[PDB]
Design a protein around this motif. Sequence first.
Motif, short mmCIF file in Angstrom:
data_model
loop_
_atom_site.label_atom_id
_atom_site.label_comp_id
_atom_site.label_asym_id
_atom_site.label_seq_id
_atom_site.Cartn_x
_atom_site.Cartn_y
_atom_site.Cartn_z
N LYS A 102 -9.61 -0.73 11.72
CA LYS A 102 -10.48 -1.56 12.56
C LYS A 102 -9.62 -2.04 13.45
O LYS A 102 -8.58 -2.20 13.54
N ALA A 103 -10.44 -2.14 14.54
CA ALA A 103 -10.25 -2.18 15.95
C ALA A 103 -9.97 -4.34 15.29
O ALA A 103 -8.54 -4.05 16.27
N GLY A 104 -9.86 -5.05 15.12
CA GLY A 104 -9.72 -6.09 14.33
C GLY A 104 -8.72 -6.31 13.82
O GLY A 104 -7.61 -7.41 14.21
N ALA B 47 3.10 -1.32 -1.92
CA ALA B 47 2.43 0.08 -2.10
C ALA B 47 1.94 0.35 -1.36
O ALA B 47 0.86 -0.62 -0.87
N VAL B 48 1.37 1.76 -1.02
CA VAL B 48 -0.05 1.98 -0.53
C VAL B 48 -0.85 2.80 -0.66
O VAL B 48 -1.12 3.26 -2.08
N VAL B 49 -2.31 1.50 -0.55
CA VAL B 49 -3.54 1.48 -1.34
C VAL B 49 -4.24 1.51 -0.26
O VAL B 49 -4.26 0.53 0.32
N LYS B 50 -4.73 2.96 -0.45
CA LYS B 50 -6.36 2.36 0.12
C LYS B 50 -7.64 1.79 0.06
O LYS B 50 -7.56 1.68 -1.35
N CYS B 51 -8.09 1.19 0.68
CA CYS B 51 -9.29 0.64 0.83
C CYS B 51 -10.70 1.37 0.16
O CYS B 51 -10.14 2.62 0.47
N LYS B 52 -11.40 0.68 -0.36
CA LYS B 52 -12.22 1.59 -0.90
C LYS B 52 -13.81 1.52 0.31
O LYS B 52 -13.98 0.01 1.30
N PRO B 53 -14.75 2.23 0.72
CA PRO B 53 -15.63 2.22 1.82
C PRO B 53 -16.67 1.28 1.70
O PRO B 53 -17.88 1.56 1.86
N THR B 54 -16.35 -0.13 1.21
CA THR B 54 -16.98 -1.06 0.39
C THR B 54 -17.86 -1.34 2.47
O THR B 54 -19.13 -1.98 2.07
N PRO C 26 -18.72 0.06 7.26
CA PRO C 26 -16.94 0.49 7.89
C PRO C 26 -15.78 0.38 7.95
O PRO C 26 -15.27 0.90 8.73
N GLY C 27 -15.59 -1.08 8.11
CA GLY C 27 -14.37 -1.62 9.29
C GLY C 27 -13.50 -1.49 7.66
O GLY C 27 -11.76 -2.04 8.40
N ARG C 28 -13.63 -0.38 6.10
CA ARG C 28 -12.45 -0.61 5.73
C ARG C 28 -12.41 0.70 4.90
O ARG C 28 -11.64 0.92 4.48
N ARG C 29 -13.68 1.22 5.16
CA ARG C 29 -13.15 2.41 4.67
C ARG C 29 -11.79 3.41 5.06
O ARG C 29 -11.47 4.38 4.51
N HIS C 30 -11.06 3.11 5.59
CA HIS C 30 -9.62 3.53 6.50
C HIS C 30 -8.76 2.76 6.04
O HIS C 30 -7.65 3.20 6.27
#
Lengths: 271, 46, 93
Positions: A206-208, A1-8, A10-14
């Motif tokens: 994110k980078a990590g 399943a393709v699921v967007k994370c919520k921008p809670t 800045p490292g999760r926004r995308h």
Amino acid sequence: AVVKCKPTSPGRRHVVKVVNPELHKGKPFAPLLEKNSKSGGRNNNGRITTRHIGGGHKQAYRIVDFKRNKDGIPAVVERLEYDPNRSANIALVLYKDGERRYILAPKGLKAGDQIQSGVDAAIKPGNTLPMRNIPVGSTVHNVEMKPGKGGQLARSAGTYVQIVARDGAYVTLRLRSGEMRKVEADCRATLGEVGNAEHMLRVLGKAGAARWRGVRPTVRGTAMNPVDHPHGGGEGRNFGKHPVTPWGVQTKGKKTRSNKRTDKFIVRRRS
Amino acid sequence: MKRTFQPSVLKRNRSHGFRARMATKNGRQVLARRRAKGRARLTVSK
Amino acid sequence: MIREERLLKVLRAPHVSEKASTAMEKSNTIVLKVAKDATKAEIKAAVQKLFEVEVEVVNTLVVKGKVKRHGQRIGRRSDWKKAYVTLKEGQNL
RNA sequence: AGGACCGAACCGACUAAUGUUGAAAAAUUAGCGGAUGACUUGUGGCUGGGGGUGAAAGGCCAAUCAAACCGGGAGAUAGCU
RNA sequence: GCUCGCCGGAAGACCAAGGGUUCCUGUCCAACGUUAAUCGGGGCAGGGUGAGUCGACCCCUAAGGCGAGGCCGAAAGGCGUAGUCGAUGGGAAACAGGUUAAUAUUCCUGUACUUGGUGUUACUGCGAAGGGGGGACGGAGAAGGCUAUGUUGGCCGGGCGACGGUUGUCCCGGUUUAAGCGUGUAGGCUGGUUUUCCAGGCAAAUCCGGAAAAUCAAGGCUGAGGCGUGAUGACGAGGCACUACGGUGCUGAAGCAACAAAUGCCCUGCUUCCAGGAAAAGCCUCUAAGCAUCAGGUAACAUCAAAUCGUACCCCAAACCGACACAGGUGGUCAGGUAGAGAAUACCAAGGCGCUUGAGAGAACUCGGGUGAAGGAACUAGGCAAAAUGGUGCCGUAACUUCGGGAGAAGGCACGCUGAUAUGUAGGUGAGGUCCCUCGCGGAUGGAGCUGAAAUCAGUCGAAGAUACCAGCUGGCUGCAACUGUUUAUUAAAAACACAGCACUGUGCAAACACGAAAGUGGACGUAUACGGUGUGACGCCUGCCCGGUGCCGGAAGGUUAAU
Ligand SMILES: [Mg+2]
Ligand SMILES: [Mg+2]
Ligand SMILES: [Mg+2]
Ligand SMILES: [Mg+2]
Ligand SMILES: [Mg+2]
Ligand SMILES: [Mg+2]
Ligand SMILES: [Mg+2]
Ligand SMILES: [Mg+2]
Ligand SMILES: [Mg+2]
Ligand SMILES: [Mg+2]
Ligand SMILES: [Mg+2]
Ligand SMILES: [Mg+2]
Ligand SMILES: [Mg+2]
Ligand SMILES: [Mg+2]
Ligand SMILES: [Mg+2]
Ligand SMILES: [Mg+2]
Ligand SMILES: [Mg+2]
Ligand SMILES: [Mg+2]
Ligand SMILES: [Mg+2]
Ligand SMILES: [Mg+2]
Ligand SMILES: [Mg+2]
Ligand SMILES: [Mg+2]
Ligand SMILES: [Mg+2]
Ligand SMILES: [Mg+2]
Ligand SMILES: [Mg+2]
Ligand SMILES: [Mg+2]
Ligand SMILES: [Mg+2]
Ligand SMILES: [Mg+2]
Ligand SMILES: [Mg+2]
Ligand SMILES: [Mg+2]
Ligand SMILES: [Mg+2]
Ligand SMILES: [Mg+2]
Ligand SMILES: [Mg+2]
Ligand SMILES: [Mg+2]
Ligand SMILES: [Mg+2]
Ligand SMILES: [Mg+2]
Ligand SMILES: [Mg+2]
Ligand SMILES: [Mg+2]
Ligand SMILES: [Mg+2]
Ligand SMILES: [Mg+2]
Ligand SMILES: [Mg+2]
Ligand SMILES: [Mg+2]
Ligand SMILES: [Mg+2]
Ligand SMILES: [Mg+2]
Ligand SMILES: [Mg+2]
Ligand SMILES: [Mg+2]
Ligand SMILES: [Mg+2]
Ligand SMILES: [Mg+2]
Ligand SMILES: [Mg+2]
Ligand SMILES: [Mg+2]
Ligand SMILES: [Mg+2]
Ligand SMILES: [Mg+2]
Ligand SMILES: [Mg+2]
Ligand SMILES: [Mg+2]
């Protein structure tokens, strides 16, 4: 399943996760696990010979059966598992003689499905036949290059070969690159595509996330000093050179295939 | 401030000890030179 | 069996101190200087044979020799082995 | 949940003062940043000098770096002082 | 010796690493000690380190090293197979009390445990270099149950106070006890059991895996703590007798309960997530060859063995790394009280210290601080520095926004104490008693007792109640970089590097590419949804024209063109 994370954060926004509920949530099958410690991209001289490799999560190696050579004996898919060592998922399958093996999980395979290998096997996804016994036009994966060697082609998530032609001892295959290639028709292929075609829709975010996967930073040549890299140097952002590798070979167009041994087997290059 | 000498006997004896010297020809030359000069202590070993 | 020649080498001297004195009166334990390669087995055998007593147990320690200066030259005394020999009963050594 | 927030340990080093034959060949004091992570740390291991290693400053490679240190060629050469 | 001050998540205690006698005692004061020194980590001498159970060695492996043959290389050598090493990890077992000037889980006392060899007796398929199982593993979070430990009461011993009062709802102190053994609890996991069959586990297997039947449901595994025992002991406030006045000798009361409670334990659990989380042995089991009323195995009992090396001492430091008795650096463990969210902070306990020149004086000036009339940034390159803000609860909070934010926006109110509500409430814990009881470490009921917020009302003191320490300044406009990160160890932390994302391009696997005269190795036990190189740099809207030059890609007619 393709699921967007919520921008809670800045490292999760995308971040875009690909989450399969069918993947075994438990631990893998222990007799098919081995240790595989990390390299840092460093060879037996201790030198970095591939850059940008280090860290990342510890991984056990799953012994996947790419040969698919246990012919005549049917097997049931017990469960589909995450494999850290590759992009496709793997299926733990149970042969009717009490033997378990990992295989590459095709698109559309699920726990309960029956697979078989060999010349007599039916034409259904997960079935491995010698490619002489496979209809021209068929989508296949885990394709052998030499009979008995084990599948080497179309193994990554979503990939597949088409059998465009058969001429006697040889089948012509369209590869994912778009290379038309010849292979001996005795070479085995498994029917269907590889699963986990949504792998490519993942966004690390994110980078990590790249660091988790054991990929260290890429420093641009143009950010370096001349002593470091052909692109090095400048008072400001300068360039004024033809793009090259760190060892001075042109890196935007120049072909690097030089293998006259295998040139006979290539019908048409990717282009 | 952390200075450069951070002693470890194991690292000492593996890096510069007698058996390390003996393990390579360049190490054995080190010993030969030091015996020729007449050094009381050939190695860190002792 | 341990040979008599060996046994006649292993025990070097009675160690004399207040601690050795207390050991003998309190806990019937003779303190001996012994050969540095003497084992507990060899010490027990030697004390039993040579001193004609019955030993309960030997305890041993290696005493590191002191670094000493002598007229501006720097020496080192030898390491030696001390043996606390607990006698049985009242053996009296 | 989080390369999430505030904040000790811990890691770091933005500002100022002090110190500059120092308490110290880079610190102290008061503030300061990060503080579940691309984190930090112990032990051990591996990469060697036109070589390494470098989230790249020509940075770092034992208080040494636009080519380490040690010994040697070696009393280099010095139209210079 | 008596006061005083300082530290007390340390400036106490115990270690590893490292050092190596610095340890204890006696003696000495030249030199060393930033002064004196009778003192010392100084000199000199003597003493001091006691282990089957702690650690090492040892068995086992990781990264990695070495490496018979081997492959490769002018030589030297490189790589690597079988092997063999290599901990920072896995693997048997001891606790309490006492004791030395100086060691103690090592000595002593008491009470234990482990492994191995024999012998004896009984039972009996033993046997591996092989099979299987196990060992055996992530991050985060949550909630129980517990204990360490603390507090209060009770109990016991002692006190009745240098100055008003103090026989009490008074003061001070103690109120401690292990491993082991026995028991099997909160909790966790899993259906057991028997029979038959089998393209699997290189052979074999009674084991593991698989399949089909029947039957029965609690069966097993694991597990803190508690409880009992250990312990009729030990320890014990204190008293008494000596003192070589430092210290010993002798005797010994109470030794309960409730409540609170970890970051420790159950828990290598459970829940959850994606980045998907050593190995090998010990161990358990299975058989092969083989051996066969024998070896060997199992059990009981007896006996023997468990060597060797370390063990002093310092160890956030005067003993290690820093040339110094140097404001530095150094990994692990322990975690008392009051207040507090706390390992912050303040004051204290245990414990440890006052930092190896002092004595005066009370100029300028410098340093570190405190306070300041009126003004309030006029200072200055610049509010640099300082001043200020600072807690908790509650009310309230703009543009803009990627809808998360912005936001602790801003701003405001309440805050101590006493009484009442309620001689302490809501809540938590829970005795006795009663009943049931697959009968126990059980359930239900029950509420004694203990603990205990928060609030409201009323009153009360001060200039001031987040009273100390501790503890955001806030807002507006704008450049740059999306962001968290990273960097010039020691004058630059940034707008630089990285970064997710994007694009171009190479690469068909003996991949490109990289290290390497080579063999190899990395890339990758990956396979074009992959990998390498290059540039750009979240996201949004986008990314125009030029192929003449240079480069790359393709072509190959013709011109030119090497060795030969
Ligand atoms: Mg790369
Ligand atoms: Mg990149
Ligand atoms: Mg630069
Ligand atoms: Mg260049
Ligand atoms: Mg420019
Ligand atoms: Mg230009
Ligand atoms: Mg003994
Ligand atoms: Mg010993
Ligand atoms: Mg954070
Ligand atoms: Mg922050
Ligand atoms: Mg830094
Ligand atoms: Mg500071
Ligand atoms: Mg913070
Ligand atoms: Mg520059
Ligand atoms: Mg340097
Ligand atoms: Mg040069
Ligand atoms: Mg010359
Ligand atoms: Mg000269
Ligand atoms: Mg001395
Ligand atoms: Mg002393
Ligand atoms: Mg003096
Ligand atoms: Mg004098
Ligand atoms: Mg001395
Ligand atoms: Mg080798
Ligand atoms: Mg050889
Ligand atoms: Mg090896
Ligand atoms: Mg070994
Ligand atoms: Mg170890
Ligand atoms: Mg001591
Ligand atoms: Mg308790
Ligand atoms: Mg914690
Ligand atoms: Mg000690
Ligand atoms: Mg001093
Ligand atoms: Mg110091
Ligand atoms: Mg530290
Ligand atoms: Mg504090
Ligand atoms: Mg204090
Ligand atoms: Mg003054
Ligand atoms: Mg002043
Ligand atoms: Mg002031
Ligand atoms: Mg004023
Ligand atoms: Mg005023
Ligand atoms: Mg004003
Ligand atoms: Mg002005
Ligand atoms: Mg002015
Ligand atoms: Mg300021
Ligand atoms: Mg201030
Ligand atoms: Mg401007
Ligand atoms: Mg930035
Ligand atoms: Mg700098
Ligand atoms: Mg700076
Ligand atoms: Mg390959
Ligand atoms: Mg850029
Ligand atoms: Mg353009």
